[PDB]
Symmetry: C3
Subunit: 488 residues, 3 copies
């Protein structure tokens, strides 16, 4: 006496947003944005980071006496540094092309220290200088990877030193030039006035001269030390020549292995954990195409946006009924699929569920979500560059570029989710109506529409007849004759 069409309802209270209506309660949803992190600084793919502590890159490479534990550092995954490290250049001065050196370090995973110029080779100079700026146990000291050359007796012969790169791969060499305060300092230390420092390779030619002038006292001294670096290629030679004011290197840094790394500015300490994507705030264990944790991440991190909510609609609208049809609303007791029928024949009732339509819809929505998710191209992220106080325009350019790309991706994500939600919520209603129309057109003129969602039979359509009606194979003539009799 009754076969009806209706859809599925449940107790879900998930809300998605479309472009024509907000706060739409749905049965099934899927968040595609992650907002959680572990909160600890961990190991990236099992490799511990380089914990500099309160030391700077310059202090580590030059051998600041306070950074004595960073003398034989092993493999590392990324560098952990403080915003304002305390122990950098103990002797006041500058470091030429510091940011370029940091950028180079952003792609190096190991260093091996090679003794290129031994300290005892300077048989005609004094190699025991020091200062109270870099002092250990009260007594003066100096950088542990550099040599300060001073006159022996009352003479400063021309100092010449050379090295040929027979180590195996590229080498990093740092030297410095000392600028005294007054003329008496220069005469006491180097015995000559008008000195020069010459450094030359196959691709480098630099000659520097000292500057003597009264300067404001930094760390109790009016003198400065300017440091420079170069990258010595394989099978190349470097030459040193100076009549005074030379801080000769004693060790060279050889690149052992290369890879993808970065410098992360955190004030934390490493803890025992293993991670893949590491933000300055904590680790991430995710699979979604979006997150809103931190922009400057290191690793394989999906995507950063300023959207606080991105939920895709995977199911139908939750419209409880207050046997009716799909005009009134969904059904609570039809837990077998998505779309289905209901019947009340002589034998017994029961909430069935159509299989082909539900399967087709499930495949379509699954393909939709997979297409949205699996079109992101996530690569290694190591963004974050350092700029000097005389490169503000470049810093502004970088900031604007990142901001613009972020805004574009945010707009794309929000547009995609809204339009997709609207299309899916229309798709489900279209499928329900298609099923009802197919059933009605196959049944033809042996039934009576009731205007609420379903029919009333003009004949005794038994259980096999009923399954045939749902099967799609309903014989019209073989029950036609009786229907005409009752309808009239």
């Amino acid at each position: 006496d009754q076969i009806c069409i209706g859809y599925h309802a449940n107790n879900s209270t998930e809300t998605v947003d479309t472009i024509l209506e907000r706060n739409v309660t749905v049965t099934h949803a899927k968040d595609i944005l992650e907002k959680t992190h572990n909160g600890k600084l961990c190991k990236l793919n099992g490799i511990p980071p380089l914990e500099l502590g309160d030391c700077s890159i310059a202090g580590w490479l030059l051998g600041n006496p306070e950074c004595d534990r960073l003398l034989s550092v092993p493999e590392w995954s990324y560098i952990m540094e403080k915003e304002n490290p305390r122990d950098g250049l103990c002797y006041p001065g500058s470091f030429n092309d510091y940011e370029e050196l940091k950028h180079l370090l952003s792609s190096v995973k190991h260093f091996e220290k090679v003794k290129i110029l031994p300290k005892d080779r300077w048989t005609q100079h004094t190699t025991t200088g020091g200062s109270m700026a870099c002092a250990v146990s009260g007594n003066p000291s100096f950088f542990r990877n550099m040599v300060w050359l001073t006159k022996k007796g009352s003479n400063y012969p021309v100092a010449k030193g050379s090295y040929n790169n027979t180590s195996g791969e590229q080498m990093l060499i740092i030297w410095g030039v000392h600028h005294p305060n007054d003329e008496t300092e220069q005469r006491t230390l180097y015995q000559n006035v008008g000195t020069y420092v010459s450094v030359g390779t196959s691709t480098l030619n630099k000659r520097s001269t000292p500057d003597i002038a009264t300067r404001p006292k930094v760390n109790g001294l009016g003198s400065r030390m300017e440091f420079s670096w170069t990258l010595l290629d394989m099978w190349d030679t470097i030459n040193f020549e100076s009549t005074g004011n030379l801080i000769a290197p004693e060790y060279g840094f050889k690149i052992s292995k290369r890879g993808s790394s970065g410098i992360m500015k955190t004030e934390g300490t490493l803890e025992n954990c293993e991670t893949k994507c590491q933000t300055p705030l904590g680790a991430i264990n995710t699979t979604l195409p979006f997150h809103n944790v931190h922009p400057l991440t290191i690793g394989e991190c999906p995507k950063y946006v300023k959207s606080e909510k991105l939920v895709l609609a995977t199911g139908l609208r939750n419209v409880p009924q207050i046997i009716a049809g799909f005009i009134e609303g969904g059904w609570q007791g039809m837990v077998d699929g998505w779309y289905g029928y209901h019947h009340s024949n002589d034998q017994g009732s029961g909430y069935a569920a159509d299989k082909e339509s539900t399967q087709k819809a499930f495949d379509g929505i699954t393909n939709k979500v997979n297409s949205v998710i699996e079109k992101m191209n996530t690569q290694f992220e190591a963004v974050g560059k350092e700029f000097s106080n005389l490169e503000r325009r470049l810093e502004n350019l970088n900031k604007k570029m990142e901001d613009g790309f972020l805004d574009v991706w945010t707009y794309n994500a929000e547009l995609l989710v809204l339009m997709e939600n609207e299309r899916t919520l229309d798709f489900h209603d279209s499928n329900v109506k298609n099923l009802y129309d197919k059933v009605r057109m196959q049944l033809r003129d042996n039934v009576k529409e009731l205007g609420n969602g379903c029919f009333e039979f003009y004949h005794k359509c038994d259980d096999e007849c009923m399954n045939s009606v749902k099967n799609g194979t309903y014989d019209y003539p073989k029950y036609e004759e009786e229907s005409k009799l009752n309808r009239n």
Copy 2:
């Protein structure tokens, strides 16, 4: 008796573009692109800008004698500068890190001039030097904020000077080095050869040597003056030492205010008006989310898109054509109460009507759609504008390409959104009308007859109350079922 389903039509002539069709006429439309301006330069939030006139930034800061009106400048919101200022470096020369100085000036908004090295302190030199390039009333003169040190008698003692920044904020200081033409000028001015100019701070250490060489004559002189600048931090000392060829500063520029500003490149003047957004052509008084007036802007402004028409569709399609039939032909021109409605023609009389629920639902949907489109855009206090020297062409190309790419991306996004939501809205209205027709048909069942034009022909006698119930959902099939079979037979 009869009843029909139809929609609204009027005498609008607006046009929207869809992806499937061009030049579609609609009843209602919304414009979300601003293309007009007042053609004036006004004050931003009540604070007038700085009008340099024919003076450059270097001429203002160095104290050009022809820029004397700028010796004491109040607070500003932005700076107006001509493309090729005439009154600049009166004495020929250069200015190291000029573009960086301008970029710093882009976020300053106020300065205070503080006398750090008074001119009378140089008791062992001469401080009354002037050139005919920077001449006032015929006699020679010089920059008003700088001091030219020259030998006193027949001797040039070592010149020393210092300043401790006890003012409370960062200070900007400019010095200079003089490059003569020949050796006799060097001997006449400084009495010795092989000189130096040394400047040192806590983070700066610079030494310079003058260059003596014959040069092409600019402004009648072959000599040049090179200027440099620095930013002195709080509680920090600057030291000056020179054996000759030093143009010492007399004043320092303290940063009083700080904020978002910029440098406009215009040849116009200031006019008595107010605004919240600015372009080099004129101000913009708008609330729409997009504009296409000028890329260069100062303040919170609608996003720039290379577009000429961005119109959303709010109402329905326009088919003026209309016994009165239904929606098969077109809309009704007399149903001014809403968007969807009916038409009842019982024996008592006739009259159009509008259904409230569908109209309210469609109105809410359209309104929130336009809200979603408009409100998903972030506008900040962008301060577009940057200068590059003649040795940084690659940087200028990079900046131009970045800006052009981002603008193009945003234009494409906005255009595609508008073009797709228009078609979605039209399909929405068609579907809503069809849904109303189908609901009425299903509630009416076989009590009526369809004539194939959106209308129904009632079989019984439907009075005014009967039709009122029909357009209400309170229509009872059994109450008229018994007589209904008689008419069909």
Copy 3:
């Protein structure tokens, strides 16, 4: 009798991808991505390129003796250069601001070499110096466009020279400074010790001092030679002055065309063709909006995308299976005259036809959609290739990041747009067919019988004329109202 409604099917095997399903076969498809080139380097707009061979830009401009084929070069469309040229600076040294010079050369289409300082005006210096690094047939030689100045007798007077730019356009001038190895070399070549080189223009002021030190041997020499360049404006003068170590110029390079070009890093030669776009792999001849050949192109051509397939679905879904059934069972292979149509079987035969109005409307809509996704692209003569030095790694990373980001954005846009448009068109065709069926049903009404498959059995007798009457849309309902009532019962 009977009249059935269905769509058209053929034997196509083209596939498109939607956002709800994959592996979807369609009747007609359009490819908008070009994946093939010509494989050869050819002329652009009839103008042959400039083939540097094994020479570099520095070697060509300076006058390297190996690059003697380029002492007179005609107008060019673009420059082809190798990744690691062999014949560059024969004398070891360096070239200041090389990348800026290449960037400037990326916008110049012709040069006119002009003799600005002849070699015979140096009447007090020797001008016949050479080296074994730049050797022609064993004997030492030197750069063809530069002059090496050496002491005459035992004296090196002050070298002085000047040129006034009266040519008619901007000029390029290159000069060099020589750094010896030991003091003996300096005394042998220039007599005096402690020399200088000064070059000055209206906007340039430089003073270089030679550096004497022992350096690793490159090309058998420990000495080096440093080169600098400048751009001299019209009606301007350049002054040279030196006491030693001056590599004076003899020719200037006047810019004479000033168009749009570039430098292509290729390792191939030139053939005899004529193209419009030129990628390093080969030439492109197409009229499509996309290609995936190479990121760097020269000329005008489609936009680059990192993808493998972009197919637009124009036709209908291809289901083969079809008394005759209708669109519900599937399409037909018989009526190849349109997309949607009717099928009738009356007493005087049977056949197929097509509804012209619906097919025309769908065709225009699809063409508008295709042209709207194609014509919204912004195409321009853009420059991509840029060069950076070993101390400019951050800038190179910035440029690479910007290019990769824009490429990813546009690729994603193209893919998602294609998917969405395919879904819309495949639903649009079904909506059109269903609308046709519903229109015929509403018009035809009670005189007929629906049958499920998608068609209608008449309750009266009909012939061809009635079939056209149904097909055109004018079907007289009352003319069979009495007749259809009799056959109903």
